[PDB]
Amino acid sequence: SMQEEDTFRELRIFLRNVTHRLAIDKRFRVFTKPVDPDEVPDYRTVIKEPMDLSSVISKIDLHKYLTVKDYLRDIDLICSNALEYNPDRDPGDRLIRHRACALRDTAYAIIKEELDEDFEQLCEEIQESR
Numbered sequence: 157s158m159q160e161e162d163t164f165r166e167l168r169i170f171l172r173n174v175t176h177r178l179a180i181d182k183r184f185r186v187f188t189k190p191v192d193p194d195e196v197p198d199y200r201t202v203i204k205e206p207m208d209l210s211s212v213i214s215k216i217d218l219h220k221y222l223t224v225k226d227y228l229r230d231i232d233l234i235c236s237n238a239l240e241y242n243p244d245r246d247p248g249d250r251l252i253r254h255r256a257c258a259l260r261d262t263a264y265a266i267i268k269e270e271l272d273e274d275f276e277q278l279c280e281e282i283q284e285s286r
């Protein structure tokens with residue numbers, strides 16, 4: 157229905173706003189673009205499904221997310237990739253992991269405060285019906 161297409165349009169507006177607020181935070185600059193294969197040629201041998209905030213924007217506009225649960229799976233993948241590739245005790249790995257955990261926690265906190273639970277439940281029930 158037109159009413160259901162309006163629901164998914166409102167979801168996309170919400171997701172673009174959250175993603176922009178993450179992408180302008182100086183702590184999260186390292187997560188804004190894909191890892192450069194020329195600088196880190198080993199990255200794509202270890203990390204099987206790369207993800208970053210520019211790719212998340214592209215996926216919103218492709219209509220890949222029908223629920224906020226769909227979106228948070230990709231935020232969780234950005235974080236888990238960083239914890240997997242950078243697991244060591246040295247300061248450079250520890251700084252990346254602290255920033256990855258802060259990206260995940262900040263996304264969840266914005267969504268807890270600003271996403272209505274009944275709006276998310278409506279999105280889930282339309283998705284289930286298709």
Ligand SMILES: O=C(c1ccco1)N1CCN(C(=O)C2CC2)CC1
Pocket residue numbers: 186187191195196199237238241242252
């Ligand atoms: O090895 C490097 C690197 C980049 C330039 C020179 O070395 N990196 C940084 C980028 N990496 C990430 O995991 C970023 C968190 C997304 C992988 C580690």
Ligand SMILES: O=C(c1ccco1)N1CCN(C(=O)C2CC2)CC1
Pocket residue numbers: 224225228264267268271272273276
């Ligand atoms: O579906 C929702 C939601 C957000 C706002 C209204 O409904 N979310 C957030 C809360 N979630 C968590 O896993 C919490 C970290 C434990 C699951 C996805």
